[PDB]
Design a protein around this nucleic acid. Structure first.
Ligand SMILES: [Cl-]
Ligand SMILES: [Zn+2]
Ligand SMILES: [Zn+2]
Ligand SMILES: [Zn+2]
Length: 121
DNA sequence: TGCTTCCCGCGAATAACG
DNA sequence: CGTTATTCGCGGGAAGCA
């Protein structure tokens, strides 16, 4: 089909026929396989570009709107994405958002229409 | 070398099904 | 509808890049 299976120990892995990348979940391999396949297009509704993954388009479109959903809770600065936010918190506040504390807040997306997680309210 | 985008397990929201 | 299958948002490390 589009993959074969591998089994080590009990573990089942799904392997991409084309690039031989390994996946624990089949939904993952299918999501990945569109990169080879290009059977689904995710075109940017603001410009030319097309993406092989829905989430790539979504990150892209937020950069069009300028919305800043990531807010540092120590000083209030807002950021476009996780990486800027984390980078800020680590350098300025000398803390890590990975472990434990709610150091930042992610606002619901309001600059465009995407699926909304009830926990962000 | 520090931004920048990619990656993929995980599971919530929604769609397709019956 | 209830009940499933599907989509895709998210974290945060990795990989890419100039
Ligand atoms: Cl904003
Ligand atoms: Zn592949
Ligand atoms: Zn665009
Ligand atoms: Zn701050």
């Amino acid at each position: 089909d589009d993959h074969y299976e591998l089994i080590v120990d009990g573990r089942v892995y799904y392997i991409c026929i084309v690039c031989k990348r390994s996946y624990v979940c089949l939904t993952s391999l299918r999501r990945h396989f569109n990169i080879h396949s290009w059977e689904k297009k995710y075109p940017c509704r603001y410009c030319e570009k097309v993406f092989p993954l829905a989430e790539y388009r979504t990150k892209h479109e937020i950069h069009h709107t300028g919305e800043r959903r990531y807010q540092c809770l120590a000083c209030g600065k807002s950021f476009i994405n996780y990486q800027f936010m984390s980078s800020h918190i680590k350098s300025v506040h000398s803390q890590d958002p990975s472990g434990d504390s709610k150091l930042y807040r992610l606002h619901p997306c309001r600059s465009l229409q995407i699926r909304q997680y009830a926990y962000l309210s």
